[PDB]
């Protein structure tokens, strides 16, 4: 299977400039590109990427999404003094040339099909192309808002070309909508485009109706246009999450891509001059690491605006942390989206509700700037500890390791048997607590060791011993996700244990630390719980913001746990604690390969039982009070 990311860029680009008074294109410097490379050069992540050549895009690749004529006008610059190129610039909006920009721009189209090509032959697994000039906003005839060519749009129809794609997902996270991408795909259901974007009422450049919530698509392709618009400024991590886990997540899933590109702009962070965003560099880390586990994780980053050289470079840095896989940095602080993200997104769920099965609930009654340095991401020695009971040899991935009891780990075992569990001489179970406290002694005392599994016998034990022990260490807090019926020994009254729970049997909860889903069996239950996993355990698991995750399975319809297994890495920096009772190989080998970075396979494109949704929208009823970044509509006031 495919391993490494792509890092595609070339000095060249930042070889044209604007050469004379503009205020509305002085923004856009050389050294973007400059300060991004260096930063990744700085933090050691450009010399861990396979560095792909650029090329030029030829005139065939050009003429999927440009006219003939378009090309043959931007084809006659190079040959044009400052005037002329003046007069070329101000027949388009908000854009310049430059003796050099059409071979730039050719480069930039280029530099993206070779990530495309890279990616969808297995060379790598991901990447990213640091290019210039962008490409969302230009369009079939024109040049607009600093993009020439349409980097991201050739990349889509180029992958449909060659590679036969039925399915192409387009993140737009750059702070500008992608009208030219809308309008390049706007009848075309083969590719969803997905676009947040500053808007305020239609104010914000550039000023288009058909940026609003309402614009689905047309014809055969409504349905597979979202727009997202951010009618205020100051967005931030909440609203930015909000968005990916009442929106965007749940079509993507259910739309089930073959391949991800993002239009890459980091406008959208803090300090943006253009954006007036809130967003932290670390936000890219998790919107990149939330889009992963699609199309077997073959996602091509492209970048595309991002105007503040500070914020740019360390958001770029996070974004290539996460496609290398490094472990997510924790958001602190999350809670509700702002009142006006609200508004956004419960009238783009209503809208869309016509064509998504997670949204198609609503549609009836008995259904409805100085920011702190980010800290160092660092990947672990060994990244997964895997213990299977004794004797039983598995082949691990490379970065996994099995796992020698030491003397001092003994002597708190016989502590803890002594003072809890004087009865208890099983030496089968003594030995899976000595395995428990030494993975986590390497998980959380040590950069050693990021996650690890465990097989275990008794459950009680072994969930008491895990969880005792990461909240003395202390870890504040523990996510707890628990699939299988019953009650464990796990307290959650005060505030640092949040229990999720899988079950079967139909319970009532009342603490709201905890959330009770209670799946009914059916051919159904792959929709539902995706549903139940990106609308009410993500939103929560990171508004909670754990220091470890305790996952759980009982030894009494688990082909969605390698996805949730990898999503839930993107609390606690990855540091997840699997305890699975009894052997099964299958499970402990889809549990260690998710935990380990792998790739995990996508579960082809279904709508879900309205006994589950209900179950599921009146849990959000109950929670969404205490953790705010539950909600998907304005509250109402008082
Ligand atoms: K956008
Ligand atoms: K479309
Ligand atoms: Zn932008």
């Avoid at 610059?77 to 721009?105: D, R």
């Avoid at 600093?146 to 794609?165: E, G, I, Q, S, W």
């Avoid at 993200?341 to 009238?347: K, R, T, V």
């Avoid at 997964?384 to 991935?397: H, I, K």
Wanted: proline share 5%; with cysteine.
């Amino acid at each position: 299977a495919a391993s490494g990311s792509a890092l595609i860029f070339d000095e060249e680009m930042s070889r044209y400039k604007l050469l004379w008074t503009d205020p509305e294109c002085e923004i856009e410097v050389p050294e973007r590109l400059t300060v991004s490379y260096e930063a990744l050069r700085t933090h050691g992540l450009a010399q861990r990427c396979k560095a792909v050549p650029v090329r030029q895009a030829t005139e065939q690749e050009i003429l999927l999404a440009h006219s003939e004529e378009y090309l043959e006008a931007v084809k006659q610059t190079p040959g044009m003094n400052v005037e002329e190129l003046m007069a070329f610039s101000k027949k388009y909006n908000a854009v310049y040339f430059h003796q050099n920009i059409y071979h730039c721009a050719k480069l930039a189209a280029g530099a993206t099909l070779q990530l495309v090509d890279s990616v969808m032959k297995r060379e790598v697994r991901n990447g990213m192309a640091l290019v210039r000039p962008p490409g969302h906003h230009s369009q079939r005839s024109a040049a607009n808002g600093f993009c020439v060519f349409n980097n991201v749009a050739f990349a889509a129809l180029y992958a449909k070309k060659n590679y036969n794609l039925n399915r192409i997902l387009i993140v737009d996270w750059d702070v500008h909508h992608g009208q030219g991408i809308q309008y390049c795909f706007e009848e075309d259901p083969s590719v969803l485009y997905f676009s947040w974007h500053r808007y305020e009422h239609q104010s914000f450049w550039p000023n288009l109706p058909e940026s609003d919530y309402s614009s689905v698509g047309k014809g055969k392709g409504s349905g597979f246009n979202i727009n997202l618009p951010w009618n205020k400024v100051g967005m931030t991590n909440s609203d930015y999450l909000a968005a990916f886990f009442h929106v965007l997540l749940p079509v993507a899933y259910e739309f089930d891509p073959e391949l991800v590109i993002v239009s890459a702009g980091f406008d959208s962070a803090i300090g943006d001059p253009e954006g007036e965003m809130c967003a932290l560099p670390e936000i890219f880390a998790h919107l990149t690491h939330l889009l992963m586990p699609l199309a077997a994780g073959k996602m091509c980053v492209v970048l595309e605006g991002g105007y503040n050289l500070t914020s740019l470079g360390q958001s770029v840095c996070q974004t290539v942390h996460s496609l290398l896989g490094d472990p997510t940095p924790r958001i602190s602080g999350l809670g509700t989206a702002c009142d006006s993200a609200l508004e956004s997104i419960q009238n783009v769920r209503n809208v869309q509700s016509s064509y998504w099965s997670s949204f198609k609930h609503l549609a009836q009654s008995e259904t409805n700037d100085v920011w702190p340095e980010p800290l160092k991401r660092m990947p672990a020695s060994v990244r997964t500890v895997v213990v299977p009971p004794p004797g039983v040899e598995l082949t691990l991935p490379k970065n996994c390791q099995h796992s020698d009891i030491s003397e001092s780990t003994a002597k708190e075992v016989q502590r803890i048997r002594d003072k809890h569990f004087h009865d208890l001489t099983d030496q089968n179970i003594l030995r899976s607590l000595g395995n428990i406290i030494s993975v986590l002694d390497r998980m959380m005392r040590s950069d050693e060791v990021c996650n690890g599994c465990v097989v275990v016998s008794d459950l009680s034990v072994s969930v008491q011993c895990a969880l005792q022990h990461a909240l003395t260490e202390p870890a504040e807090r523990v996510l707890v996700v628990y699939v299988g019926d019953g009650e464990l020994p796990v307290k959650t009254n005060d505030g640092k244990v949040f229990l999720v729970q899988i079950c079967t049997k139909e319970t009532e909860d009342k603490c709201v630390n905890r959330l009770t889903l209670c799946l009914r069996e059916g051919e159904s239950l792959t929709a539902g719980f995706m549903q139940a996993l990106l609308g009410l355990i993500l939103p929560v698991a990171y508004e909670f913001n754990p220091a470890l995750v305790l996952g759980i399975v009982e030894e009494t319809l688990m082909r969605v746990w390698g996805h949730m297994t990898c999503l839930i890495q993107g609390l606690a920096r990855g540091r997840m604690l699997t305890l699975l009772q009894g052997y099964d190989k299958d499970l402990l080998e889809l549990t260690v390969s998710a935990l380990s970075g792998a790739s995990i396979s996508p579960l082809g494109p279904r709508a879900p039982k309205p006994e589950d949704v209900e179950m599921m929208e009146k849990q959000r009823q109950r929670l969404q009070e205490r953790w705010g970044l539950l909600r998907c509509t304005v509250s109402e006031s008082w």
